[PDB]
C-alpha cells in the first residue's frame, strides 16, 4: 500500500517555503538566465535548508510582460538543470541560437542536461492587450546544492532556472516564484 505510506511520511516532514520576486526587468534579445532555487540557503529558518539537498514538493512560477514603445514578444523558459556543477547556464546551452524563435540546443537536450518544465511565449501588443501574464504550478523534484550561500557556485543538479528572451529591449517583464519543499 505504497500510496498511503507516502503520506504518513510526508505529514511528519516539515514543508518549508521560499518566495522570491523579480520585477521591472527589460526584455533581452540575447536573453538572460535567472536563478530561482538558489535563494534557498543554509540556515534554520522556514525558507532555508539543512545540508545540500531539498525536495521540492511543488513550485509555482508567475511571468508578466508589458509592451513599451513597440509591440513585442516575451519568451519564458522554465527549466531544471540535471547536471549543474556550480554555475548559471548560459543561453546558448539551452537555445540553439540566441534568438527568441529558436529551438533547443540539440546536443544538450540529447544528453538531457536540461529538462524543460515550461516554455511560454507572450505577445504584447500596443494596439490590443499590452499586458499579459501566466501562472504555472508543477510538482517538484530533488535539488542538490554545491555550497551554502546564494551564489552561482552553490547551484547543483536539480537547480531550477528561467530563461528570458524577446525581440525588443524596451519592454518590461516581472516574475515571482514559490517552492514548497521538505528538508528531512
Q: Is 130 annotated for ligand binding?
A: no
In the complex, minimum distance from the CB of residue 23 to Ca ion, in angstroms, rounded to a whole number: 26
Tell me if 71 contacts a second copy by CB under 8 A: yes
Say which entry of Ca ion, a second copy, none residue 97 contacts (CB below 5 to 8 A, set by partner kind).
a second copy
Q: Is 81 annotated for ligand binding?
A: no
C-alpha span between 105 and 110 (Å, rounded):
9
Say which entry of Ca ion, a second copy, none residue 62 contacts (CB below 5 to 8 A, set by partner kind).
a second copy
Query: In sequence order, which residues have a C-beta less than 8 Å from that of residue 66 and are 6 or more positions away?
Result: 124, 130, 131, 171, 172, 173
Q: Is 71 annotated for ligand binding?
A: no
Say which DSSP state 128 is in: S
Q: Which of 30, 116, 150, 184 binds a second copy (CB under 8 A)?
A: 184
C-alpha span between 38 and 34 (Å, rounded):
10
Total binding residues for a second copy by CB under 8 A? 84
Angle, CA of 79, 2 and 60, to the nearest 5°: 25
Site for a second copy in 107-136 (CB under 8 A): 107, 109-113, 121, 123, 125-133, 135
Q: Is 103 annotated for ligand binding?
A: no
In Å, what is the CA distance from 110 to each residue of 6, 73, 93, 114, 125? 33, 28, 12, 9, 36
C-alpha span between 171 and 101 (Å, rounded):
17
Say which entry of a second copy, Ca ion, none residue 9 contacts (CB below 5 to 8 A, set by partner kind).
a second copy
Say if CB 106 and CB 114 are below 8 A apart: no
C-alpha span between 156 and 106 (Å, rounded):
22
Tell me if 80 contacts a second copy by CB under 8 A: no
Say which DSSP state 158 is in: T
Tell me if 14 contacts Ca ion by CB under 5 A: yes
Tell me if 125 contacts Ca ion by CB under 5 A: no
Residues tagged in the binding site annotation for Ca(2+): 14, 44, 50, 53, 127, 183
Interacting residue ranges for Ca ion, rule: CB under 5 A: 14, 44, 50-51, 53, 127-128, 183
Residues tagged in the binding site annotation: 14, 44, 50, 53, 127, 183
Amino acid at each position: 500500500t505504497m500510496r498511503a505510506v507516502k503520506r504518513m511520511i510526508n505529514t511528519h516532514l516539515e514543508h518549508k517555503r521560499f518566495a522570491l520576486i523579480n520585477s521591472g526587468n527589460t526584455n533581452a534579445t540575447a536573453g538572460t538566465v535567472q536563478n530561482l532555487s538558489n535563494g534557498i540557503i543554509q540556515g534554520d529558518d522556514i525558507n532555508q535548508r539543512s545540508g545540500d539537498q531539498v525536495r521540492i514538493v511543488s513550485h509555482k512560477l508567475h511571468v508578466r510582460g508589458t509592451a513599451i514603445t513597440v509591440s513585442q514578444t516575451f519568451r519564458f523558459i522554465w527549466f531544471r538543470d540535471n547536471m549543474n556543477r556550480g554555475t548559471t547556464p548560459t543561453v546558448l546551452e539551452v537555445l540553439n541560437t540566441a534568438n527568441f524563435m529558436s529551438q533547443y540546443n540539440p546536443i544538450t537536450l540529447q544528453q538531457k542536461r536540461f529538462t524543460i518544465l515550461k516554455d511560454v511565449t507572450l505577445n504584447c501588443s500596443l494596439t490590443g492587450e499590452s499586458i499579459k501574464d501566466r501562472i504555472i504550478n508543477l510538482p517538484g523534484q530533488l535539488v542538490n546544492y554545491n555550497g551554502a550561500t546564494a551564489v552561482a557556485a552553490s547551484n547543483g543538479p536539480g537547480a531550477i532556472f528561467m530563461l528570458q528572451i524577446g525581440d525588443s529591449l524596451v519592454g518590461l517583464w516581472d516574475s515571482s516564484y514559490e517552492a514548497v519543499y521538505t528538508d528531512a
